[PDB]
Structure 1
């Protein structure tokens, strides 16, 4: 069906590549 591999993008996570703004999300998860 498609679940065990959900949320991992073929052109990004799967190739160890980051998209242009995901770091912004990560930084927002660190309070302070």
Structure 2
């Protein structure tokens, strides 16, 4: 509903919630001059 989205916002039940990665998210994280 708003600021920084929601609460549970942006955590995917089938990926973030289970600690599974989608097949190309790597490509994003590596461009933020390698992720977290």
- TM class by shorter chain equals 0.7 to 0.9
Q: Could you say what the CA RMSD is over the residues aligned between the two structures, in angstroms?
A: 3.6
Q: Which runs of 4+ in 1 moved over 3 A?
A: none
TM-score by length of 2: 0.75
* CA offset digits 1:1-32 (Å, max 9, x no partner): 98110000000000000000000000000079
Q: Which runs of 5+ in 1 are unaligned?
A: none
| Higher share in helix | 1
* Alignment CA distance shift 1:11-1:30 (3 Å): same
